[PDB]
Design a protein around this nucleic acid. Structure first.
Ligand SMILES: [Mg+2]
Ligand SMILES: [Zn+2]
Ligand SMILES: [Zn+2]
Ligand SMILES: [Zn+2]
Lengths: 133, 490, 387, 107, 98, 95, 382, 88, 159
RNA sequence: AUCGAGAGGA
DNA sequence: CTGCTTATCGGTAG
DNA sequence: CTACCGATAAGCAGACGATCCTCTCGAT
């Protein structure tokens, strides 16, 4: 506890002392004759997809809420059809460092008529060793 | 991860700074630079013989760099060049272009005060090219006329000879980019000054900070401008179907449009005057692609925003090339975490947390000594701590240890490299910024610990100047044994 | 601050230059309760909560009565303003609206993100200030006034009343720097320019005590630089000025000066014809303040005094924009008419010109050269209620 | 040694380097009232011979320029008369070692 | 701080039209040498002339303020030992209660 | 993580140079360019696998050398080249 | 005075006093402010100046220069600051925060410049000190060719002491039955009495010790003995008389030559500059000079034989040890001092945060600019 | 002209002691070779660390490396890891 | 002021002296005065000291101030470090500033002087005056990313 | 991924 | 809170 | 006496400004 440290009772930590929920939100739109699409991706002459597993996405290209996400797991599967010289991947993975459970998923539309999505992921965070106070 | 060179390899010894000649620029290049376009010759997505390519680097990850071959990750990018019809001033040298034009008169182009003056005699003998030019300037800035003849030093009369026609020399001023003076108005054209330096005697160069072969005033103002290659101005962004080029590419387009804005007035419909209006903008862009911080106007739109960059502000101090990417680079094999202090550690020790240990690696050569522990290390793999990822073979091929079919095997031969996790008692550099010392930069011993902090000894608190109030701290890991020495011995 | 910008400031900024060249002349403004016309659909009453989820802008439509009912654009509405609706809603109503009862709003909102307008602080105009100058400076004291109006465009005509020559330095002249001008003018010429000709009446506007000889002695060297110019007509004449100014003048440069002293020289007080003594007293008051600090009877003016500083808040903040934005909409209709000479309204300009500024920080649209950049409108911050 | 007691008109300083090999040094009396080399800070300066120069220049293996320099109109250097090439030796006292040798070529 | 607010800013016009209708000699008709016992009057830093006996002018102003007839925002700065009286109606001054 | 200019300076104090070349070459960027023995710049066309290095204009075939410098340096020198300045690199100790 | 009233009231079981007694955290001011009173707050040197022209806050009258009106907090942090007090204290605190964020700013501009001005300055090999051009700066690093790492503070006995106390200490007169080495101190002491070949060697010792005292006092006019110097002789001596376990009751086995011609031949072996030519070996002498004062000094026939009695076996070791340690203290050709010299000044520069002379980083800003525009100029005439 | 130079074995002005930097990269340059399965010139007393061996080889003066010490003018002095004294 | 000075008995006794302290500076005319000791008069203006008493006095005077900057704040930095800094300033001939005007024009190789403040121009005139960079200094070898002539790389190992 | 802004950590 | 440039003044030469 | 040249004094203008770090937002 020397030099601006402190010792924290683990026992108290476990009964609930400084425990916290943490929520994060992920977002996506479509296009700006050429429109982006929401779907669980595949190869498709694309051979430029992300690293993690899309396996948590159903058919709309989104995760369901009950599921559990961790590491490079894809959250929003979304493909973009390009001619040009088919469908190039534009999927947003879960944050490199983050983990936890999907809380709510919002499917809506914007002023222009774009398929619009907001995914909320939730983690519980316990007072760990290097946490500031 | 490169190739094999009949050309030897050697340390750089000397660095010579000079200037570009029309002779060089036109022979050093392979590109021609004709059209102000970039790509799509009527929709045709390729390269085009205009600005990007004709014997230069490619974009679609192709070895089509013209026998330059081999991979973007190899071709430095030759270069070509852009034929400026009308001569064009240089930006950073406006100061000196004036200065020299204040030291040399008109018509013949000759030194103003020879050895005949008994003060200039203290300039042609002094060492250094820098202080010499500062000496001459002080004397030949008052005197105007080229002089008839004219002493004779030393002594009485009447006179001797040297050569020249006695015309008056103007009082030159700075007007944005042009040079205008008064005689007793006439503006000094770029064509007018090039012709003054195209001649000029051989002992006129050396007399004032210049060189016969390396740098001439006839090169100081720009005959033929060099065109920088693609690896200096990259491409796309957020499309893969809707372009999105850099920004030095935009400014070269502005010069190219202005260059064949004059030839469409020389060999085509030719007005006599108000064509000087176009000579300012073609000079302005080469005066703005090289610098944009002087006086008058900045720049702005397109296909982008404002103002502008213009090389120099890639060079200027902090976050630019020298002080940001050369003197202090960002580097691999490093880690950062909040520190907390440990009394049950030894002074020279540093608690590296487990997950960081699984991340950072040290290349170890397979030597008959370590095999027994090193092969176990391959078998443990990049998940369990005393393990390893990446195994490097004879031909420099990369075994990724966290994918692949043969990874729960691998018989390690001699002289193979194996990148391993960090194990206990390895020597690592461990600093805290702001780094005020040697002693904010100390080697440490490793003991892999649980929990996410870097653990370190309370008595090493002082030389790093740290609290536990949330101070984060950096750690660097060597990669050569020699370095591993130079860490624990220095 | 936002309620004053809607319930009035909006009104009067519309007027003024609205009248056009027939007579397209603007009038009242009706302001809706926040709506959003979404594509292939109806006009919808957008509540706070809906805006944030949907990445929309909680803005209402402006309507303005034009002359020989019309949509001008969309104004971002400050929450718990005026009609965030909300500012009407009872506690129970708030929960059903899925909006927090502890929410106090502040913050309206753009592209679904909540945005706060940050109070800006500058030095107040229309105050007389005296400033003792450094050592290598020829001038010793300077009386400065950032004269600028309150209801009529944005003209910042800064005026300096300098007092050259150090203590010791012989003959301390006083000159003043006028706006459109180029050189400095002795004050005795300024007065004579306004219409006060006889000295003594000059020093009456300045010095307000017959006994006070010390000040009067201070002004003796000024008069000496005057009696080159001993009549009104020639006092407007010594505004020249210098090297070359067109050439063809005399009767044209006199009328040039005769405007600068009414339109530019102290733009407050007034800007019209029949006022000359209203200003010369004020000018005399400046000289009184400048010399009152040169005799060291009163202190040099404090720069950090909070009562001579003003805060530009969300209201008059939006004013700055709306003035500029409304004039760009105005001078677009003037150019649509020009090509007509035989609908027209570009409502997006005001709509997106407010949104852009309120989204970024660059308070002034696409120019950014206005160094207001300083993160005017920041992204709320909701880590804890107290923050 | 010229000993003027007020000032020199610049038309006179240009007739100084006009008689080689002889040298003339102009000295003001306001600068000569007290001896500067007597002062606490100033240590003893000792001019050395051209034969000892080469001895310094070879035995420390230096270049003409590479030596620490002293000014031509330097207060001490004027007091001993140093032309270009002429080097001084300076025996300053130090809290690290009793003595320390310093050298300055006159530029 | 907790108590502080920003001035919203009223129309200056009813103050002007009040003063000139309660003594207050306009600036044009002012003669400095024969009325030195004069408090000059400022409104948003505009010199609207001079007032003789401001003592009773003050207590009438302060009462109108405290009653409501003059917007309670408007600050009324009487200088005793400088012979000035300034009335400010700007939109940005910071004020507090007490 | 950035190994700042201020951080370099501490490694210099320690006299550890082999580490500073490790940190500024092996980590970060290292690049293998190709200089003309005569003209001195980066003109040489790397016709590798075919042994050819024919730098035209100077008509060089044999007198061409390989060097190890950071890509930032190559970026620096190119930028200078484009700004009409020759930053030449020479192979031998003497001039 | 209020402080020191609270200082001599804190009992020995008082924890705050105990951490101060340890030097672990805190000091006297910390005590004074917490228990007694927090004192007079200051902004820009001067005590709280008027804002409200002629008064500090509108809670006071004008022209009030008394203590509380101009920002003196009579109460301690335990007692509580008052309404006014608190704002005053706030005004002070704020300046602290302000200048900190402007100090490190001004320091890191110092530090960077220093570092960039010295940089390439290293030793080498000719043990001198030079830059990239090979333009020499120092001919011997730090004027003595010693690394600062090894160096330590050591009193120079020759510098202090009375002319009466000095002889007593150092003079060995064999021709003088009241100033000879007692036959209890030396094996030969009684036979050494008289002798004219050993009273030209002792007169050689005592005369150099007196040339030293006139030489040191000419250097250190301060009268200060204690000076940074390599090799701790005091500790080599304490190592000698505990390694060889010497009783202080039986006489030495040293000769008078052993000592006197010992120290003079060790002096020859304290190499720093090595060149066998005239000029180098002349600077070799002019680098060891202070450390040889100090060793004679110390050691001194009288010292060695009477103060800390030494045997011939021990003394030969001591002499061997000093030469050994001395060669370890030399700067290593290659030491980069450029940086090291900057770093050593730029670091405490950062650790400066707040009586008329300009001081601190602001001054240091003039010094490193060679400023013609210096704030506080001053003659100091004697 | 290549070449000379060079400064003979007689008249050595340089410290006969091995410098801490000379030591650190002697160990360094050897541990580079030791790590890479190369002949060892001492008996290995149960130590396996490639830098640990270079230390033992140094204690017994069995390292065949030769220092070139460069003096500003250009001159160099050659010293073997046998003539040099390790004393740090 | 307090002085420590030798008594005829041998010891240093405390002998207090009278010392005058001034708010102005003109050493050219103050030491020339009858009464004061013109072998002890000191100024806190090392710039004047230089001008009057020679470059070498300029050193120590500049040292005394670097010293008082440090020691006034209860710190001690070892002589060699200040003494180095000080002397770098002095060895060019006059008082060389630790700013871009001083030590950046001083004939040093361009690349090294690049990595400072006037980055671009330094390169420019280097192209104009045909500067030959020596490449034996620190920054030059950092730019080219090579074994820098520093400690370790000051010499060169062979077989 | 680049540029431009602000918020916070030591 | 600083170096460089321009203008003005006193001095010498024809 | 007038004109030219040199020297000094005053007035105007430039090139940087702690190190690293983590996040959020908007844009051709
Ligand atoms: Mg803290
Ligand atoms: Zn290529
Ligand atoms: Zn000619
Ligand atoms: Zn070439």
């Amino acid at each position: 506890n020397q030099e601006d440290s402190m010792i924290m009772n683990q026992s108290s930590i476990d009964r609930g002392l400084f425990r916290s929920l943490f929520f994060r939100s992920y977002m996506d739109q479509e296009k700006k004759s050429i429109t982006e699409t929401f779907e669980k991706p595949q190869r498709t002459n694309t051979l430029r997809m992300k690293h993690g597993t899309y396996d948590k996405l159903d058919d709309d290209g989104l995760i369901a809420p009950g599921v559990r996400v961790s590491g490079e797991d894809v959250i929003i599967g979304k493909t973009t059809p390009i001619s040009p010289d088919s469908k190039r991947d534009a999927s947003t993975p879960l944050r490199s460092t983050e983990n936890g459970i999907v809380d709510q998923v919002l499917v809506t539309t914007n002023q222009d008529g774009l398929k619009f999505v907001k995914v909320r992921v939730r983690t519980t965070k316990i007072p760990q060793i290097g946490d500031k106070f | 991860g490169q190739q094999y060179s009949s050309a030897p390899l050697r340390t750089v010894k000397e660095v010579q700074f000079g200037l570009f000649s029309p002779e060089e620029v036109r022979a050093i290049s392979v590109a021609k630079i004709r059209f102000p376009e970039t790509m799509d010759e009527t929709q045709t997505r390729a390269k085009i013989g205009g600005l990007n390519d004709p014997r230069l680097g490619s974009i679609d990850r192709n070895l089509k760099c013209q026998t330059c071959q081999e991979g973007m990750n190899e071709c430095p990018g030759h270069f070509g060049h852009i034929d400026l019809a009308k001569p064009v001033f240089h930006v950073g040298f406006i100061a000196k272009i004036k200065k020299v034009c204040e030291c040399v008169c008109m018509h013949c182009g000759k030194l103003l005060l020879d050895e005949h003056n008994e003060l200039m005699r203290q300039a042609l003998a002094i060492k250094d090219s820098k202080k010499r030019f500062a000496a001459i300037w002080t004397l030949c800035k008052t005197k105007m006329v080229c002089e008839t003849d004219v002493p004779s030093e030393d002594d009485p009369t009447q006179l001797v000879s040297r050569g020249g026609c006695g015309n008056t020399q103007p009082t030159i001023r700075k007007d944005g980019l042009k040079l205008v003076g008064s005689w007793k108005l006439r503006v000094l054209s770029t064509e007018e000054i090039l012709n003054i330096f195209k001649h000029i005697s051989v002992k006129d160069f050396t007399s004032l900070g210049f060189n016969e072969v390396f740098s001439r005033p006839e090169w100081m103002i720009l005959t033929c401008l060099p065109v920088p290659p693609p690896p200096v101005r990259p491409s796309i962004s957020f499309n893969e179907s809707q372009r999105g080029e850099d920004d030095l590419t935009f400014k070269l387009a502005d010069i190219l449009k202005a260059n064949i804005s004059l030839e469409t007035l020389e060999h085509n419909g030719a007005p006599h005057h108000a064509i000087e209006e176009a000579e300012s903008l073609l000079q302005f862009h080469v005066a703005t692609y090289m610098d944009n911080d002087i006086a008058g106007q900045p720049q702005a739109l397109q296909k982008s925003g404002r103002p502008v960059k213009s090389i120099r502000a890639r060079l200027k101090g902090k976050e630019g090339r020298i002080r940001g990417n050369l003197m202090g680079k960002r580097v691999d094999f490093s880690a950062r975490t909040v520190i907390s202090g440990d009394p049950n550690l030894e002074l020279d020790q540093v608690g590296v947390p487990k997950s960081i240990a699984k991340t950072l690696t040290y290349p170890e050569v397979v030597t008959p000594y370590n095999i027994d522990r090193l092969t176990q290390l391959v078998r443990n793999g990049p998940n369990e701590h005393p393990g390893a990822k990446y195994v490097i073979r004879d031909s420099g091929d990369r075994i990724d240890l966290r994918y692949s079919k043969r990874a729960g095997d691998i018989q390690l031969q001699y002289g193979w490299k194996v990148e391993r996790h960090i194990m206990d008692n390895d020597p690592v550099l461990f600093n805290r910024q702001p780094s005020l010392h040697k002693m904010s930069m100390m080697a440490h011993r490793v003991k892999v610990i649980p929990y996410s902090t870097f653990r370190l000894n309370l008595s090493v608190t002082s030389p790093y100047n740290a609290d536990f109030d949330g101070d984060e701290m950096n750690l660097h890991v060597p990669q050569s044994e020699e370095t591993r020495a130079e860490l624990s011995q220095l | 601050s936002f309620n004053q910008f809607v319930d009035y400031t909006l009104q009067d900024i519309i007027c003024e230059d609205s009248t056009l060249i027939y007579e397209i002349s603007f009038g009242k403004i009706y302001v809706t309760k926040p709506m959003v016309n979404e594509s292939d659909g109806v006009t919808h009453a957008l509540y706070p909560q809906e805006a944030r989820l949907r990445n929309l802008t909680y803005s209402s439509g402006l309507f303005v009565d034009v002359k020989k009912k019309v949509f001008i654009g969309r104004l971002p509405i400050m929450l718990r303003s005026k009609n965030c609706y909300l500012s009407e809603a009872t506690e129970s109503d708030l929960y059903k609206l899925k909006e927090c009862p502890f929410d106090m709003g502040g913050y309206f909102i753009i592209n679904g993100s909540e945005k706060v307008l940050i109070a800006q602080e500058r030095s107040a105009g229309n105050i007389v200030q005296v400033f003792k100058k450094a050592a290598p400076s020829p001038i010793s004291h300077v009386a400065e006034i950032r004269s600028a109006l309150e209801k009529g465009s944005r003209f910042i005509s800064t005026l300096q009343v300098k007092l050259y020559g150090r203590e010791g330095s012989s003959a301390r002249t006083i000159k003043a720097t006028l706006p459109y001008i180029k050189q400095d003018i002795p004050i005795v010429i300024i007065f004579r320019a306004l219409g006060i000709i006889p000295d003594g009446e000059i020093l009456e506007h300045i010095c307000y005590d017959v006994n006070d000889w010390q000040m009067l002695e201070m002004l003796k060297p000024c008069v000496e630089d005057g009696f080159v110019i001993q009549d009104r007509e020639t006092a407007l004449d010594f505004i020249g000025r210098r090297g070359t100014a067109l050439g063809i003048k005399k009767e044209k440069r006199i009328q040039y000066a005769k405007d600068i002293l009414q339109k530019e020289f102290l733009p407050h007080i007034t800007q019209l014809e029949g006022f000359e003594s209203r200003k010369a007293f004020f000018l005399g008051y400046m000289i009184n303040r400048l010399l009152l600090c040169a005799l060291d009877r009163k202190d040099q003016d404090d720069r950090d005094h909070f009562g001579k500083k003003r805060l530009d808040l969300a209201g008059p903040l939006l004013a700055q924009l709306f003035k500029t934005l409304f004039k760009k909409l105005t001078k677009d209709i003037f150019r649509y008419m020009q090509r007509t000479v035989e609908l027209a309204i570009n409502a997006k300009t005001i709509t997106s010109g407010l949104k852009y500024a309120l989204a970024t920080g660059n308070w002034g649209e696409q120019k950014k050269a206005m160094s207001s950049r300083a993160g005017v409108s920041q992204v709320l911050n909701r880590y804890t209620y107290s923050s | 040694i010229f000993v003027y007691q007020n000032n020199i008109t610049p038309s006179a300083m240009k007739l100084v380097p006009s008689i080689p090999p002889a040298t003339i040094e102009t000295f003001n009396e306001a600068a000569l009232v007290v001896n500067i080399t007597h002062h606490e800070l100033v240590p003893k300066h000792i001019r050395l011979s051209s034969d000892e120069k080469r001895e310094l220049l070879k035995r420390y293996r230096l270049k003409e320029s590479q030596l620490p320099r002293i000014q031509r109109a330097d207060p001490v250097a004027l007091y001993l008369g140093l032309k270009r090439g002429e080097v001084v030796k300076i025996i300053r006292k130090s809290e690290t070692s009793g003595r320390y040798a310093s050298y300055r070529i006159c530029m | 701080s907790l108590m502080s607010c920003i001035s919203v800013g009223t129309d200056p016009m009813p103050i002007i039209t009040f003063l000139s209708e309660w003594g207050m000699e306009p600036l044009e008709d002012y003669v400095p040498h024969q009325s030195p016992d004069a408090t000059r009057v400022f409104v948003n830093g505009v010199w609207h002339g001079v007032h003789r006996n401001p003592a009773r002018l003050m207590e009438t102003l302060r009462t109108l303020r405290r009653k409501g007839d003059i917007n309670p925002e408007v600050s009324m700065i009487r200088d005793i030992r400088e012979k000035e009286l300034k009335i400010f109606t700007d939109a940005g001054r910071v004020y507090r209660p007490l | 993580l950035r190994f700042g200019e201020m951080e370099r300076d501490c490694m210099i104090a320690h006299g550890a140079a082999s580490f500073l070349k490790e940190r500024l070459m092996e980590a970060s960027d290292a690049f293998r360019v190709h200089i003309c023995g005569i003209c001195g710049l980066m003109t040489v066309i790397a016709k590798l696998n075919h042994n050819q290095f024919e730098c035209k204009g100077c008509d060089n075939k044999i007198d061409i050398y390989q060097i190890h410098i950071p890509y930032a340096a190559k970026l620096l020198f190119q930028e200078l080249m484009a700004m009409n300045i020759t930053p030449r690199l020479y192979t031998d100790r003497s001039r | 005075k209020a402080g020191r009233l609270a200082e001599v009231n804190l009992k020995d079981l008082n924890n705050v006093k105990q951490m101060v007694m340890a030097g672990s955290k805190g000091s006297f001011i910390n005590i004074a402010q917490m228990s007694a009173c927090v004192g007079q707050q200051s902004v820009e040197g001067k005590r709280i100046a008027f804002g409200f022209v002629d008064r500090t806050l509108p809670h006071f009258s004008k022209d009030d220069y008394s203590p509380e009106s101009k920002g003196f907090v009579e109460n301690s942090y335990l007692r509580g600051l008052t309404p006014q007090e608190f704002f005053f204290h706030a005004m002070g605190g704020r300046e602290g925060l302000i200048d900190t964020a402007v100090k490190t700013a001004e320091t890191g501009y110092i530090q960077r410049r220093l570092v960039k001005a010295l940089e390439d300055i290293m030793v080498h090999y000719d043990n001198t000190t030079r830059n990239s051009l090979g333009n020499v700066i120092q001919f011997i690093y730090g004027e003595d060719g010693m690394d600062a790492a090894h160096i330590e503070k050591q009193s120079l006995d020759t510098i202090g002491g009375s002319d009466a106390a000095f002889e007593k200490r150092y003079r060995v007169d064999l021709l003088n039955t009241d100033h000879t080495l007692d036959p209890s101190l030396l094996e030969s002491g009684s036979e050494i009495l008289g002798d004219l070949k050993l009273q030209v060697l002792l007169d050689e010792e005592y005369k150099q010790l007196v040339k030293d005292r006139k030489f040191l006092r000419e250097v250190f006019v301060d009268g200060e003995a204690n000076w940074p110097l390599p090799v701790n002789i005091r500790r080599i001596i304490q190592n000698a008389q505990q390694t060889f376990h010497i009783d202080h009751t039986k006489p030495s086995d040293l000769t008078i030559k052993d000592i006197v011609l010992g120290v003079k031949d060790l002096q020859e072996n304290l190499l720093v500059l090595r060149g066998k030519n005239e000029i180098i070996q002349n600077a070799q002498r002019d680098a060891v000079t202070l450390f040889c004062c100090l060793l004679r000094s110390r050691l001194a026939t009288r010292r060695v034989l009477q103060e800390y009695r030494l045997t011939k076996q021990a003394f030969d070791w001591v002499l061997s040890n000093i030469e050994a340690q001395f060669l370890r203290s030399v700067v290593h050709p290659g030491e980069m001092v450029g940086v090291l010299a900057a770093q050593s000044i730029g670091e405490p520069a950062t650790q400066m945060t707040l009586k008329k002379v300009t001081s601190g980083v602001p001054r240091l800003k003039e010094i490193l600019n060679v400023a013609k525009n210096m704030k506080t100029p001053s003659l100091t005439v004697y | 002209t290549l070449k000379e130079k060079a400064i003979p074995k007689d008249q050595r002005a340089t410290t006969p002691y091995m410098t801490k930097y000379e030591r650190a990269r002697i160990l360094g340059t050897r541990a580079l070779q030791i790590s890479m399965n190369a002949p060892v010139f001492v008996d290995l007393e149960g130590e396996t660390d490639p830098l640990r061996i270079a230390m033992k080889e140094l204690a017994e003066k069995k390292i065949p490396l030769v220092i070139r010490r460069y003096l500003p003018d250009g001159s160099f002095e050659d010293w073997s890891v046998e003539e040099l004294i390790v004393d740090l | 002021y307090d002085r420590k000075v030798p008594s005829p008995t041998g010891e240093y006794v405390k002998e207090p002296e009278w010392v005058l302290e001034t708010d102005g500076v003109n050493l050219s005319e103050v030491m020339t005065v009858p009464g004061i000791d013109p072998t002890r008069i000191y100024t806190n203006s090392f710039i004047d000291i230089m001008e009057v008493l020679g470059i070498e006095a300029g050193r120590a005077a500049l040292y005394k101030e670097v010293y008082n900057v440090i020691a006034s704040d209860g710190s001690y930095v070892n002589y060699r470090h200040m003494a180095l800094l000080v002397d770098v300033m002095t060895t060019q001939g006059g008082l060389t500033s630790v700013t871009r005007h001083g030590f950046n024009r001083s004939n040093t190789g361009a690349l090294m002087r690049c990595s400072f403040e006037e980055t671009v121009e330094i390169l420019f005139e280097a192209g104009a005056s045909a500067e030959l960079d020596d490449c034996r200094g620190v920054s030059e070898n950092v730019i080219l990313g090579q074994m820098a002539p520093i400690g370790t790389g000051a010499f060169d190992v062979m077989i």
